[PDB]
Design a protein around this nucleic acid. Structure first.
Ligand SMILES: O=P(O)(O)O[C@H]1[C@@H](OP(=O)(O)O)[C@@H](OP(=O)(O)O)[C@@H](OP(=O)(O)O)[C@@H](OP(=O)(O)O)[C@H]1OP(=O)(O)O
Ligand SMILES: Nc1nc2c(ncn2[C@@H]2O[C@H](COP(=O)(O)OP(=O)(O)OP(=O)(O)O)[C@@H](O)[C@H]2O)c(=O)[nH]1
Ligand SMILES: [Mg+2]
Ligand SMILES: [Mg+2]
Ligand SMILES: [Zn+2]
Ligand SMILES: [Zn+2]
Ligand SMILES: [Zn+2]
Lengths: 97, 144, 49, 96, 99, 73, 301, 241, 98, 144
RNA sequence: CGUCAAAGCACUUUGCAAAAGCUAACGUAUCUGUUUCUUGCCUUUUACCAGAAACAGCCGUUUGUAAGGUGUGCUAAUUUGACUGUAUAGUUUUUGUAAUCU
């Protein structure tokens, strides 16, 4: 049931045993998957009804699906300074002399 | 370290090896008294010698002849009869015959390098096979 | 049980209530251990409310 | 459980709920249980067809509930973490 | 019950104020006084009776009567962090052991 | 586990019970169980037409109880 | 000849030799890392100051690669690991394990695919979330540098043998070798379009090869002399310009080398205090980045 | 408690509650005054309590151990004490000989006595300062303590005699060293040791146990001298430097 | 007098305990405002009794639960709702802090 | 490193038994009423001295008659003498019983009295009615 | 106790950094010094006497972090953190009062 927790705050549409559909934002679920939906709209065959905060029973629920993503360094020791390149008179690798 | 007559009795396997440890202690005392014939650091070389030898004796007791119980061996290390760090070095590959522990650490050298004794003789020239100044060591490397 | 230093018996009794403590918790001072046990056993003071 | 906690939160407000019949009830919630049995006052029942009646005191059994329309300002009710043994979602101060 | 408690009770009943009694520092009966459970119950009962007497000295109405069976008295140990009643502890039995 | 329903205030009062299938029974509540099984005495049944028959002592299974109603002010 | 405040800018930081410093694909940011087990993030334009450090790595940053999103950073460590650092928050995302030696090189794909080689004579390709090597290729001698084609089926791995191996991830047929080198290949870099490969080897010759399915024999285009490698056996980098007409390299002779892709030496500019591990060009302007084993990184034109 | 943090051995007073409480009745005047003076010192300490200031952890011993000129080992305490006494004596001898002051004799008990009658020139040249004399007297006290322990180790005295001797040493620094001359603020510590002696004595010699030698409860005086040394160490190091 | 400074030092007279910013709680402040404004869930009462019988500890019991940030002090009780340096000195409530 | 300890209950009980001569027997803290640190700070500030406690320097020497006047405020003419104002009052209530009250410090007013008496003999049960406690008989009440 | 996650773990050495924010024991302990004032004893200086203010030093403590050491392991051990964590076909949710038409 860990996956079910991942659906918190997502927007959900739930088909019911009646056949209606509630769409809204999930607030909290249950062991019997009682759902709490905020800002809920009703889909009665399509007719629109504002419901608001709605608690669905576990038995009433048939299926559910998501419709939207959930609403959503300190420092370092580095310091820069301009400088030029100094040409050496040698042509040899560092190890070899 | 020092044990009284009323102290807790050492484990069972101690008494048969007690006399030779006593001999080690006796000669350590003699080396303390013995003076002369060396520079400021050469006179202190035989100390490490005997110390390594004593620790090697205990190491030989456990790991090569299993003549002592594990309880007695932990007791011996806890009573400083052996150097735990030196034995730990002896238990890893490349340091089977380590002389002492000052010839492995690089913070005590001028140029941040180990001692000459740690170096295999095959890559060392014939002329520079000299006695270590730290402990008189004549070759630590496991190859030799 | 909390005071009298009975770790195993107290642990078993709390396990029966599904109250689970970390092993380092039984080795606490008597008074903070009492507070921890009482806060796990009797949660929010809902009786007063 | 958080859902029954919210249902308990609702008591004293006006909540609308519909049962397995299809009738919707509009009244003041006065009691609630873990089974979601509800006690109501001043109910205005709207039947499935549309007939409107009135009731004074009812004790609706929980098993015959489809959903409830909780008042909106309970959206900010706190959802507390529930341990294994705890049966009521409450603020915690012990281990968990 | 002390002198200021008596004054508070008198002024509250004189002003028609419901009173909820919290019997604090219960843990001192167990850890300090070391009373046996029965004598601890007697001590609690005596304190409640003293509060009820102080109430009755003003108005003998039954509306102002504090006693645990009315849910009007809470046993608390705020240092150890608990404050229960008869009904709260009873519920804490019921949730564990059924219906 | 289970839980006892709160019905002490409903005891020994004239009550109306709505069962499943559009039933309806009067009566005085006399007892209840964990599963809301209720017991009624000297009760009266309503039919769809509307005439009341004396139905008597009744022991309703709690599974079928839709609502329990009192009428007093 | 750019938007830089100064023609030449010295960057001071780090507590040991810096081994890699790579530009953001957008050309707005870049990071650096080395033997100090630390990653420093910088700002290309403005005051050029640090805005974050990436602590937690338990080893030297042998190589690192920016992500196309410019939001996550992948770092290769000498301690047989491959960490994924979130640039904008600085927390551990994931640590990919499975190698058996020092992870030498790293490369990223146009698709979240990572590739790497290590001294255990293996090559491993990683998904950004799999946390495990989905494909593994075993060789006989340790591998030193990788290049992944942006199209996503051919990988070029250069190692001790002095011959570049081309591996087809799907085909697993390897009977096609880009012979021509004679010593250790320090670095490989693919052209922007995906047609030419830049190779640097310890045999002192920087060579350029073509990356096409079809060839007219002797796939070797041309070689460049001068870039010499010291006795420290360092991993010297090579870079492809944004227009892929100037090829760059670093040499252990304190020289930064830029060639015109036609065999004519263009830049010989000195300026480093030690062996220069990495060199890179800006994808928008004519900036050249230097990274030497002297705790310093140079800006360019 | 049942859980703590292992305070240092000298951070445990063990008799603080004796004078933090009231004085027992029917005591001589000196005991009452001792109680009052110790309470005064405690109150003065508590009044000027400063919240500790933040600072990074630094320690001389770790810095010295980092160098190659210092080594480490484990030895008996009496051996370490003998070594410290001998080293201090050698150091004091080497400064009395790099001055040409070879006619002055520093005996093994740390007394500077000339070996011959001195002219005015020698007497003015051989005048040392407060730093040298203070350090010499501290060294003399240390040698007294280590010599007591050595006597106990030889079997010349038993444990009870050793404890009594140590208590006497710590209570009678002003009569055994003469260190007070070169730093007179030691008199506070001397007064404190006398006060502690009074408390312990009048709580020790009660009943069957009477007057005489034997009281060896030397922890309070010992920690008093430790806390004097804590403050005098930086001053002496600066002066000797 | 010599005591009067020429340049007065910057003095901020703090008398009570007061958190500069509102500490977090287990609930939301808007929720509490909704209960106070649009609900009958508000109870107004006083906590009274004798001296040192534990009435401030009763409120500390609730503060420990609603305010997770607060922690018990080292050597005494929290004594929330004291908020006066004088009361913290005498270790007893002198004012009626709501 | 020997930096933290955890002891059992029998061990702590036995240590408490062994070192029983060197620990207080108060467990109340009401014993130090006017003889604790804050009272001493107040006494030092006011220059008074409780006859069992320390004596300090005045800390405030500014009491010269610079005003040269009695201010007709503290004069006997208009003052009711009932009981002398002892210094215990001036230390207990520093801000009421004396003017010129600067640098004084306030102390804890009261503590709940401890009612724990340790058992005399272990054979008795831990929970036992002590005869010193008065019996609970209060048939002097008029309840509802 | 259980599940998930990442961290080798236990002990220990050294370096760096920090330690009141909401009135409160970094240390339930306790020394020394400087400057500016006021005192005590005083033939002058150090050395002193005892109170205050402002400053410092020393003996110590805690935490974070980095690199190592010893002993055991990676063919497993321990620690840390998080968790909406448990049964159950027999009325109150998950082993169907369903289909049938309208
Ligand atoms: O110096 P005081 O504190 O006054 O104590 C001295 C004396 O000390 P001196 O030897 O320094 O004079 C003894 O004390 P210790 O020498 O033993 O410390 C002795 O103590 P005991 O009798 O306990 O051995 C006794 O003190 P008291 O008489 O209080 O026991 C005596 O005191 P008087 O000076 O009063 O004779
Ligand atoms: N043993 C024990 N002590 C308690 C308990 N509750 C409070 N105390 C102690 O009671 C003392 C006073 O606590 P406070 O909360 O200040 O009591 P108060 O009534 O607010 O005091 P005032 O405000 O002056 O009247 C403190 O020592 C608390 O630790 C308890 O439940 N058990
Ligand atoms: Mg209060
Ligand atoms: Mg003169
Ligand atoms: Zn050697
Ligand atoms: Zn050696
Ligand atoms: Zn050597």
């Amino acid at each position: 049931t860990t996956k079910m927790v991942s659906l918190l705050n997502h927007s959900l549409n739930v088909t019911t045993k009646d056949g209606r559909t509630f769409v809204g934002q999930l607030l909290a679920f249950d062991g019997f998957m009682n759902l709490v939906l905020s800002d809920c709209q009703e889909y009665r065959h399509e007719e629109k009804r504002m419901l608001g905060l709605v608690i669905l029973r576990g038995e009433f629920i048939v299926s559910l699906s998501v419709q939207g993503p959930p609403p959503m360094l300190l420092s370092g020791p580095g310091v820069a300074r301009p400088a030029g390149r100094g040409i050496p008179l040698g042509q040899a690798p560092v190890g070899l002399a | 370290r020092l044990r009284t007559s009323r102290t807790k009795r050492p484990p069972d396997g101690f008494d048969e090896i007690e006399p030779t440890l006593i001999e080690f202690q006796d000669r350590m005392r003699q080396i303390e008294n013995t003076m002369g014939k060396g520079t400021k650091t050469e006179m202190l070389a035989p100390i490490f010698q005997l110390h390594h030898q004593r620790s090697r004796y205990i190491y030989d007791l456990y790991y090569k002849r299993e003549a002592i119980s594990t309880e007695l061996y932990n007791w011996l290390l806890k009573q400083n009869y052996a150097d735990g760090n030196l034995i730990a070095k002896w238990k890893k590959p490349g340091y089977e015959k380590l002389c002492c522990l000052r010839c492995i650490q690089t913070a005590e050298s001028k140029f941040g390098s180990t001692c000459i004794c740690r170096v295999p003789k095959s890559k060392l020239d014939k002329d520079q096979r000299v006695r270590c100044t730290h402990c008189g060591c004549n070759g630590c490397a496991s190859c030799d | 049980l909390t005071i009298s230093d009975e770790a195993e018996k107290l642990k078993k009794h709390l396990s029966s209530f599904q109250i689970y403590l970390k092993p380092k918790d039984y080795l606490l001072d008597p008074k903070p251990l009492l507070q921890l046990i009482c806060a796990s056993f009797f949660g929010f003071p809902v009786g007063f409310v | 459980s958080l859902c029954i906690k919210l249902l308990h939160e609702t008591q004293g407000h006006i909540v609308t709920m519909e049962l397995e019949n299809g009738s919707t009830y509009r009244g003041k919630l006065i009691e609630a249980e873990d089974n979601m049995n509800c006690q109501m006052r001043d109910i205005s029942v709207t039947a499935r067809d549309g007939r409107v009646s009135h009731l004074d005191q009812v004790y609706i059994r929980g098993s015959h509930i489809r959903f409830l329309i909780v008042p909106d300002m309970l959206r900010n009710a706190p959802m507390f973490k529930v341990g294994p043994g705890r049966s009521v979602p409450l603020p915690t101060r012990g281990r968990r | 019950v002390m002198i200021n408690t008596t004054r508070i009770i008198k002024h509250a009943i004189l002003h028609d104020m419901p009173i909820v009694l919290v019997l604090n520092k219960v843990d001192r009966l167990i850890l300090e006084l070391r009373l046996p459970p029965n004598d601890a119950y007697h001590k609690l009962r005596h304190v409640i009776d003293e509060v009820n007497d102080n109430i009755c000295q003003i108005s003998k109405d039954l509306k102002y009567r504090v006693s645990p069976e009315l849910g009007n008295v809470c046993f608390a140990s705020c240092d150890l962090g608990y404050c229960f009643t008869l009904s709260s502890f009873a519920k804490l039995y019921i949730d564990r052991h059924g219906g | 586990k289970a839980g006892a329903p709160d019905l002490k205030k409903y005891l020994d009062r004239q009550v109306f019970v709505q069962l499943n299938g559009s039933r309806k029974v009067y009566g005085v509540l006399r007892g209840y169980d964990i599963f809301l099984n209720i017991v009624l005495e000297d009760s009266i049944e309503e039919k769809v037409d509307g005439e009341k028959v004396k139905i008597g002592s009744v022991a309703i299974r709690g599974n079928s109880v839709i609502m329990i109603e009192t009428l007093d002010k | 000849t750019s938007d830089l405040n100064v023609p030449n800018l010295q960057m001071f930081g780090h507590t040991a030799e810096v081994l890699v410093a790579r530009f953001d694909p957008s050309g707005s940011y870049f990071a650096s890392g080395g033997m100090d087990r630390q990653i420093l993030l910088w700002n290309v334009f403005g005051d050029v100051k640090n805005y974050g450090v990436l602590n937690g790595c338990k080893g030297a940053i042998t190589d690192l690669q920016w992500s196309r999103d410019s939001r996550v950073v992948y770092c290769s460590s000498s301690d047989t690991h491959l960490m994924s650092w979130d640039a904008v928050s600085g927390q551990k995302i994931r640590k990919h394990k499975g190698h058996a030696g020092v992870v030498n090189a790293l490369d990223v794909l146009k698709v979240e695919l990572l590739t790497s080689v290590s001294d255990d004579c293996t090559m491993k390709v990683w998904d950004s979330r799999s946390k495990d090597c989905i494909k593994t290729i075993e060789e006989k001698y340790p591998l030193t540098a990788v290049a992944i084609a942006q199209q996503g089926t051919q990988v070029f791995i250069g190692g001790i043998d002095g011959a570049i191996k081309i591996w087809d991830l799907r085909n697993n047929h390897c009977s096609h070798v880009l012979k021509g080198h004679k010593d250790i290949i320090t670095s490989l870099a693919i052209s922007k379009d995906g047609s030419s490969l830049l190779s640097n080897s310890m045999d002192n010759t920087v060579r350029i090869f073509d990356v096409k399915p079809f060839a007219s024999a002797q796939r070797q285009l041309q070689i460049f002399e001068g870039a010499i490698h010291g006795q420290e056996h360092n991993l010297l980098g090579v870079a492809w310009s944004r227009n892929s007409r100037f090829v760059g390299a670093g040499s252990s002779d304190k020289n930064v080398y830029v060639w015109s892709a036609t065999g004519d030496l263009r830049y010989v500019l000195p300026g480093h205090e030690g062996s220069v591990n990495h060199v890179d060009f800006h994808p928008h302007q004519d900036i050249i980045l230097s990274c030497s084993s002297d705790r310093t990184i140079f800006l360019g034109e | 408690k049942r859980s703590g943090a292992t305070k240092r051995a000298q951070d445990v007073p063990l008799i603080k509650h004796w004078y933090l409480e009231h004085c027992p009745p029917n005591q001589p005047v000196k005991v009452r005054v001792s109680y009052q003076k110790l309470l005064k010192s405690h109150v003065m300490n508590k009044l000027h309590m400063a919240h500790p200031k933040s600072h990074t952890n630094r320690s001389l011993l770790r810095q010295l151990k980092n160098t190659k000129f210092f080594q480490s080992t484990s030895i008996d305490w009496v051996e370490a004490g003998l070594q410290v006494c001998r080293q201090g004596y050698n150091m004091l001898q080497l400064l009395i000989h790099r001055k040409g002051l070879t006619y002055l004799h520093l005996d093994y008990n740390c007394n500077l006595k000339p070996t011959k009658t001195l002219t005015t020139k020698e007497r003015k040249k051989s005048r040392f300062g407060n730093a040298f004399h203070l350090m010499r007297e501290i060294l003399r006290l240390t040698k007294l303590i280590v010599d007591s322990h050595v006597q106990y180790r030889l079997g010349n005295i038993d444990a009870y005699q050793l404890a009594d001797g140590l208590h006497y040493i710590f209570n009678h620094v002003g009569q055994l060293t003469g260190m007070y001359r070169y730093k007179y603020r030691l008199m506070r510590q001397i007064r404190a040791c006398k006060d502690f002696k009074h408390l312990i004595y009048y709580r020790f010699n009660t009943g069957p146990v009477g007057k005489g030698p034997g009281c060896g409860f030397w922890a309070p005086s010992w920690r008093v001298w430790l806390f004097f040394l804590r403050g005098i160490v930086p001053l002496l190091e600066r002066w000797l430097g | 007098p010599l005591s009067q400074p020429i340049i007065e030092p910057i003095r901020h007279k703090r008398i009570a305990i007061e958190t500069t910013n509102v500490p977090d709680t287990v609930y939301k402040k808007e929720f509490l405002f909704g209960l106070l404004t649009g609900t009958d869930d508000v109870r107004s009462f006083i906590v009274a009794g004798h001296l040192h019988h534990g009435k401030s500890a009763l409120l500390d019991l609730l503060v420990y639960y609603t305010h997770p940030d607060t922690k018990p002090p080292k050597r005494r009780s929290l004594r929330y709702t004291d908020t006066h340096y004088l009361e913290r000195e005498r270790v007893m409530s002198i004012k009626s802090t709501p | 490193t020997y930096r933290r300890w955890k002891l059992n209950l029998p061990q702590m009980a036995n240590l408490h038994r062994l070192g029983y001569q060197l620990l207080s027997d108060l467990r109340d803290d009401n014993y130090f009423y006017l003889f604790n640190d804050n009272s001493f700070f107040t006494a030092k500030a006011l220059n008074v001295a409780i006859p069992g406690g320390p004596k300090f320097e005045p800390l405030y020497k500014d009491e010269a008659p610079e005003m040269e006047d009695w201010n007709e405020f503290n004069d006997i003419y208009k003052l009711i003498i009932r009981h002398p104002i002892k210094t215990e009052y001036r230390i207990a209530f520093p801000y009421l019983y004396n003017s010129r009250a600067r640098s004084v410090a306030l102390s804890e007013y009261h503590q709940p009295s401890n009612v724990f008496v340790p058992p005399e003999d272990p054979d008795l049960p831990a929970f036992f009615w002590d005869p010193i406690i008065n019996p609970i008989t209060s048939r002097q009440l008029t309840l509802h």
